[PDB]
Amino acid sequence: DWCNVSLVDTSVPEPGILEHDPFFCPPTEATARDFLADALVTLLV
């Protein structure tokens, strides 16, 4: 059938990260103190 003869040639058909930033959540930094020496002073006076 010559009517459905198809010819095709070459053509030019030419058509991940994860991150979220919150603002802050710092813990108790510099965790050290004492309430004896000052108590000793104010109970030694």
- Using the minimum distance from each CB to another protein, give the nearer residue, 18 or 43: 18
Stretch that binds another protein, among 5-13, 15-23, 25-33, 36-44 (CB under 8 A): 15-23
Partner interacting with residue 32 (select from ligand NAG, another protein, none; CB below 5-8 Å by kind): none
For the chain, count helices (H), then strands (E): 1, 0
Q: CA–CA separation, 19 vs 24, rounded Å?
A: 15
* Interaction of residue 18 with another protein, rule CB under 8 A: yes
**Contacts of 39 by beta carbon, 8 Å cutoff, 6+ apart:** none
Chain contacts with ligand NAG (rule: CB under 6 A): 3-4
